[PDB]
Write an enzyme that holds these catalytic residues in place. Structure first.
Site, PDB file in Angstrom:
ATOM      1  N   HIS A  40    -104.089  59.372   7.739  1.00  0.00           N
ATOM      2  CA  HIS A  40    -105.125  59.835   8.705  1.00  0.00           C
ATOM      3  C   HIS A  40    -106.473  59.136   8.464  1.00  0.00           C
ATOM      4  O   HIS A  40    -107.402  59.442   9.167  1.00  0.00           O
ATOM      5  CB  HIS A  40    -105.301  61.396   8.644  1.00  0.00           C
ATOM      6  CG  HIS A  40    -105.996  62.007   7.411  1.00  0.00           C
ATOM      7  ND1 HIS A  40    -105.390  62.472   6.373  1.00  0.00           N
ATOM      8  CD2 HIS A  40    -107.345  62.194   7.222  1.00  0.00           C
ATOM      9  CE1 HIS A  40    -106.295  62.935   5.546  1.00  0.00           C
ATOM     10  NE2 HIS A  40    -107.497  62.776   6.053  1.00  0.00           N
ATOM     11  N   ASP A  84     -98.357  61.621   4.948  1.00  0.00           N
ATOM     12  CA  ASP A  84     -99.767  61.129   5.099  1.00  0.00           C
ATOM     13  C   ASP A  84    -100.056  60.023   4.050  1.00  0.00           C
ATOM     14  O   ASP A  84    -100.763  60.266   3.099  1.00  0.00           O
ATOM     15  CB  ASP A  84    -100.724  62.322   4.899  1.00  0.00           C
ATOM     16  CG  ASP A  84    -102.181  61.984   5.294  1.00  0.00           C
ATOM     17  OD1 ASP A  84    -102.435  61.069   6.066  1.00  0.00           O
ATOM     18  OD2 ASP A  84    -103.091  62.657   4.825  1.00  0.00           O
ATOM     19  N   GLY A 175    -114.433  63.346   2.840  1.00  0.00           N
ATOM     20  CA  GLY A 175    -115.051  62.095   2.256  1.00  0.00           C
ATOM     21  C   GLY A 175    -114.181  61.659   1.080  1.00  0.00           C
ATOM     22  O   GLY A 175    -114.206  60.502   0.697  1.00  0.00           O
ATOM     23  N   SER A 177    -110.755  62.342   1.064  1.00  0.00           N
ATOM     24  CA  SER A 177    -109.437  62.032   1.667  1.00  0.00           C
ATOM     25  C   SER A 177    -109.020  60.569   1.482  1.00  0.00           C
ATOM     26  O   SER A 177    -109.831  59.679   1.668  1.00  0.00           O
ATOM     27  CB  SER A 177    -109.457  62.285   3.176  1.00  0.00           C
ATOM     28  OG  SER A 177    -110.101  63.545   3.357  1.00  0.00           O
TER      29      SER A 177
HETATM   30  C1  LIG Z   1    -110.462  60.104   9.613  1.00  0.00           C
HETATM   31  C2  LIG Z   1    -111.559  60.503   8.599  1.00  0.00           C
HETATM   32  C3  LIG Z   1    -112.756  59.638   8.990  1.00  0.00           C
HETATM   33  C4  LIG Z   1    -111.916  62.014   8.823  1.00  0.00           C
HETATM   34  O1  LIG Z   1    -111.733  62.718   7.602  1.00  0.00           O
HETATM   35  C5  LIG Z   1    -111.875  64.086   7.424  1.00  0.00           C
HETATM   36  C6  LIG Z   1    -112.523  64.862   8.362  1.00  0.00           C
HETATM   37  C7  LIG Z   1    -112.696  66.210   8.139  1.00  0.00           C
HETATM   38  C8  LIG Z   1    -112.225  66.797   6.978  1.00  0.00           C
HETATM   39  C9  LIG Z   1    -111.571  66.035   6.024  1.00  0.00           C
HETATM   40  C10 LIG Z   1    -111.124  66.628   4.845  1.00  0.00           C
HETATM   41  N1  LIG Z   1    -111.275  67.912   4.536  1.00  0.00           N
HETATM   42  C11 LIG Z   1    -110.707  67.939   3.347  1.00  0.00           C
HETATM   43  C12 LIG Z   1    -110.561  69.047   2.513  1.00  0.00           C
HETATM   44  C13 LIG Z   1    -109.914  68.878   1.256  1.00  0.00           C
HETATM   45  C14 LIG Z   1    -109.712  69.950   0.344  1.00  0.00           C
HETATM   46  N2  LIG Z   1    -109.016  69.754  -0.751  1.00  0.00           N
HETATM   47  N3  LIG Z   1    -110.204  71.142   0.588  1.00  0.00           N
HETATM   48  C15 LIG Z   1    -109.455  67.591   0.917  1.00  0.00           C
HETATM   49  C16 LIG Z   1    -109.621  66.514   1.777  1.00  0.00           C
HETATM   50  C17 LIG Z   1    -110.244  66.740   2.966  1.00  0.00           C
HETATM   51  N4  LIG Z   1    -110.519  65.940   3.924  1.00  0.00           N
HETATM   52  C18 LIG Z   1    -111.394  64.671   6.258  1.00  0.00           C
HETATM   53  O2  LIG Z   1    -110.721  63.875   5.348  1.00  0.00           O
END
Ligand SMILES: CC(C)COc1cccc(-c2nc3cc(C(N)=[NH2+])ccc3[nH]2)c1[O-]
Ligand SMILES: [Ca+2]
Ligand SMILES: [Cl-]
Length: 223
Positions: A40, A84, A175, A177
């Site tokens: 993603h 993913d 951020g 991810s």
């Molecule tokens: C396509 C990207 C530019 C957009 O990325 C994102 C947009 C909104 C939320 C996330 C995200 N929330 C997250 C929450 C968690 C966690 N362990 N609680 C981990 C990774 C996440 N990644 C995220 O990776």
């Protein structure tokens, strides 16, 4: 990373920042020409930034290389985030040294209770956005499958595992991810999703890399 600490410049040499005019996801260097991140985090126009500590200052050790191709897993499902994982091939190989090094893929899957290191430049607040300039680190254990399925009933596939703290306060976040979950020196997970960040009973969910080693190997070998 919420509840984590400053890693120390270049103490996580395989960590990379995917950049498209701003940092949007993390990734892991697995060899001098390939990086693994989450499907993603895919988009075109990606520049891979290696040897980074402060992402807003060129302090030295940085290598900025464009991606030649990004290979999203063919069975990636954007609705469930199952499979993913994504491979990015770099336009030129990176110069590896002690500040930029690759991490090894696992030979076995890790067990619950295994302590791992998660890092990234993602949000440091569970309520509001506060993005850091330097790399943050968090030590988190892998949770049992029963605690993970109890927390996200019907949403965990066999390609996902939970890691973190059910009491809340420490977790990966937006951020982060696409970045690495390393245990006993092996890349065991990829930061994938979670419900909010550091919420009680809602641990982080990671792509289970050990189920993709043959795919990664066959795909790098044919490209
Ligand atoms: C396509 C990207 C530019 C957009 O990325 C994102 C947009 C909104 C939320 C996330 C995200 N929330 C997250 C929450 C968690 C966690 N362990 N609680 C981990 C990774 C996440 N990644 C995220 O990776
Ligand atoms: Ca920098
Ligand atoms: Cl279930």
């Amino acid at each position: 990373i919420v509840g984590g600490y400053t890693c120390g410049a270049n103490t996580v040499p395989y960590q990379v920042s995917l950049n498209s005019g701003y940092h949007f996801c993390g990734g892991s260097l697995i060899n001098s020409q390939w990086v693994v991140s989450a499907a993603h985090c895919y988009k075109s126009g990606i520049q891979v930034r290696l040897g980074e500590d402060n992402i807003n200052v060129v302090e030295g050790n940085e290598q900025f290389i464009s991606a030649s191709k990004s290979i999203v897993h063919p069975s990636y499902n954007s609705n469930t985030l199952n499979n993913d994982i994504m491979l990015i091939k770099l336009k030129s190989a990176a110069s590896l040294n002690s500040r930029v090094a690759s991490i090894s893929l696992p030979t076995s899957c890790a067990s619950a209770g295994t302590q791992c290191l998660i890092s990234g430049w993602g949000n440091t607040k569970s309520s509001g956005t506060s993005y850091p300039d330097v790399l943050k680190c968090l030590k988190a254990p892998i949770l049992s499958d029963s605690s993970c399925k109890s927390a996200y009933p019907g949403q965990i596939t066999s390609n996902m595992f939970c890691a973190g703290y059910l009491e809340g306060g420490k977790d990966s976040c937006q951020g982060d991810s696409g970045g690495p979950v390393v245990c006993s020196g092996k890349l065991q997970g990829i930061v994938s999703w979670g419900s909010g960040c550091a919420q009680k009973n809602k641990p982080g969910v990671y792509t289970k890399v050990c189920n993709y080693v043959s795919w990664i190997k066959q795909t790098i070998a044919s490209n």
